[PDB]
Amino acid sequence: SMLTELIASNRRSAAIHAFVDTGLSTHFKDGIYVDISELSRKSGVNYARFSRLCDFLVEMGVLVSNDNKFRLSDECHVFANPESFESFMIKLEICSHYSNAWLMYGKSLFEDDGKSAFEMAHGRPFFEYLDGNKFLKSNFDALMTRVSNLIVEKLLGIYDFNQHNRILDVGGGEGELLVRISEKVKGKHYAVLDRYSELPVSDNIDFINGNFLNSIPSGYDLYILKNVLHNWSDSDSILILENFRKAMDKNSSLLLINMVKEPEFSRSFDILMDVLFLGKERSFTEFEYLANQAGLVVQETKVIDQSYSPYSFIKLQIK
Amino acid sequence: SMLTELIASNRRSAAIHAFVDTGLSTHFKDGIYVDISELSRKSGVNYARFSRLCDFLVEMGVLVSNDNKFRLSDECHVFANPESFESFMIKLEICSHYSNAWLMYGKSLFEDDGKSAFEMAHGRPFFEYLDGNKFLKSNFDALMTRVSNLIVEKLLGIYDFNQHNRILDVGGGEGELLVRISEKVKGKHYAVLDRYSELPVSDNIDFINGNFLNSIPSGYDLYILKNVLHNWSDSDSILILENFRKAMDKNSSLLLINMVKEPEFSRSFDILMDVLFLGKERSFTEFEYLANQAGLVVQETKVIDQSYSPYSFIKLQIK
Ligand SMILES: Nc1ncnc2c1ncn2[C@@H]1O[C@H](CSCC[C@H](N)C(=O)O)[C@@H](O)[C@H]1O
Ligand SMILES: Nc1ncnc2c1ncn2[C@@H]1O[C@H](CSCC[C@H](N)C(=O)O)[C@@H](O)[C@H]1O
Ligand SMILES: COc1cc(O)c2c(c1)C(=O)c1cccc(O)c1C2=O
Ligand SMILES: COc1cc(O)c2c(c1)C(=O)c1cccc(O)c1C2=O
Ligand SMILES: [Cl-]
Ligand SMILES: [Cl-]
Ligand code: NA
């Protein structure tokens, strides 16, 4: 039935995890057709059992079959690359920590102590727990780095970064966005703020250990906040934007860059943000409402299409 | 994108789990339209956050939205009933035990110790582990009871059980099949063989502690083996059927009743059977092959329709 297969949606994620996490998918580079008999001899993977997984992956549209051999579909070519954001995504998606968070989601809907399903499962909020877990921190940071790399070219296209001199990326993680921007727009002052136990090192990037809930370093003419606000409540989002308004002078600009809620796209990410952070997906007008409450005004708006989501690009200045 | 949402398939299962496992779905009986504000007052569920889950459940087709109220779809009426097989399926599908089995699935494809992904995660094979885990045993046995209840009427319709005098259901679990058959077909000796520490009790039914890998007791004119062979390898399946042939005389009949592999249905259950049991789904032809190797021959075959799967009904006798 359609209902029992909907209940069993998890099996699709688990099948992809087995295929990608083992590195079996790396044998499918460059659109090659793989003979599972040959793959078994060199890799040691069970012929009969991996062939049955491949049949399920064909059903899913991950693999295509010809002459009893399997290739990756064009869409799923990314699974052959272990450095692809999709590879890091599947490693996190059904990991034990995420699974235990999802099992607390039901109970989390009845509590009002401001603890996410993740915190209920782990005893600390997501980013505080990641401080003590290499697997989660390295894979999450790697995922954010890959998606940052993918948006750079379009971001440099739609907005002229050459007009700015002092640039701070707030919650910029490993700093991939400004590292790539600094290679195209050379000779500016580039800074990245995040929570660092050990400072990253990269040519002409000033890495700052900080906390955007407490304070944003003042004196920059361009601030960037990319994919941060969806990890936070309305009240915490207003606090962050208030801290920007206090850091900014009349000539300063804040680029609020975020995946945006659109009716046509899936609500699944909105639920994941609830589970991990008590966060949420927001529309443009919802972001604008928070910014207006924080004492910021929209000067410019654009849409950036990415394969996986639409993005809101909102240029903010103090009222 | 389609691929990121395919990777995020687990979120669909986890959303349904939060909705059903909490008992929130029991407020949606008889296709009623629910005001989430009203539900929040009564149940104590967070209005805003549950409304967002309901938006995702509408996207999935689990809920239907009208006038900002939500009802279960006709197909998903079963979610309002905590005694439905779908309710028990949901409880097991993304439980910690299954999650940890799925996380070993990739690694299991590179080993030939004969340990399932489940055994690699939990240290014992499925049914041996269930002996010591009430959560898995109670919910698994409840699931099997519910799916047995749904097929009883169709079995009674397509086979004359009244022609037999002594009937043994082998691996019959809680004995629901014969409990229900005994209500319609009177004046028979009914027995159920399974792995029991303490014997179940039912007015019409004699429960026997046994092991179908070791021996099947003689002196029954009808034997039944329903939904057992998919938990076993081809070699173990032939051993089970050989033990039937040794227990049976020329006048004995064996009803082999099993979900059957048809090309038009999902391979997802085939992969679950690999993970839990190193089992598999089989076609009619594949079942007949095993029976023939065990020294049994097909007297009668029928296809039984169930909502979630087609079934093979095979009457077997000794050569
Ligand atoms: N209180 C806090 N102060 C500063 N950074 C924080 C923070 N809480 C979380 N973060 C950081 O916020 C980031 C969210 S993920 C976004 C990373 C990057 N801006 C990108 O778009 O790819 C993480 O790097 C996390 O470490
Ligand atoms: N070695 C063994 N001997 C007997 N029963 C066994 C067994 N190993 C597993 N079983 C039983 O096999 C059953 C598989 S599930 C099928 C239950 C029932 N026939 C139905 O169709 O609903 C379980 O009840 C399990 O306890
Ligand atoms: C597995 O758990 C995840 C937690 C996540 O936070 C994310 C993702 C996955 C993710 O795939 C993602 C993709 C694109 C842009 C993003 O911002 C994310 C993101 O944030
Ligand atoms: C979640 O774990 C499961 C393990 C299972 O073994 C099953 C099921 C679920 C199951 O939903 C099911 C449905 C119909 C007929 C069946 O035989 C099964 C079955 O066997
Ligand atoms: Cl600086
Ligand atoms: Cl309301
Ligand atoms: Na500061």
From TrEMBL, chains A, B:
Q: Which residues form the O-methyltransferase C-terminal domain?
A: 113-295
Matching entries from Gene3D superfamilies are given as:
Vaccinia Virus protein VP39, Winged helix-like DNA-binding domain superfamily/Winged helix DNA-binding domain
Tell me which domain of life the UniProt entry assigns to the organism this sequence originates from: Bacteria
Catalytic residues, chain numbering: 230
Q: Does the keyword Acetylation apply?
A: no
Pfam families recorded = Methyltransf_2 (PF00891)
Q: Which UniProt keywords apply?
A: Methyltransferase, S-adenosyl-L-methionine, Transferase
Q: What CDD domains does this protein map onto?
A: AdoMet_MTases
Which InterPro entries does the entry link to? COMT-like (IPR016461), COMT_C (IPR001077), SAM-dependent_MTases_sf (IPR029063), WH-like_DNA-bd_sf (IPR036388), WH_DNA-bd_sf (IPR036390)
**BP term (GO), one:** methylation
GO MF assignments? O-methyltransferase activity
> What residue range is the signal peptide?
none
Keyword match Transferase? yes
**Which PANTHER family does the protein's record reference?**
O-METHYLTRANSFERASE CICE (PTHR43712:SF2), PUTATIVE (AFU_ORTHOLOGUE AFUA_4G14580)-RELATED (PTHR43712)
Query: How is this protein named in the record?
Result: Methyltransferase
Organism for this UniProt entry: Photorhabdus laumondii subsp. laumondii
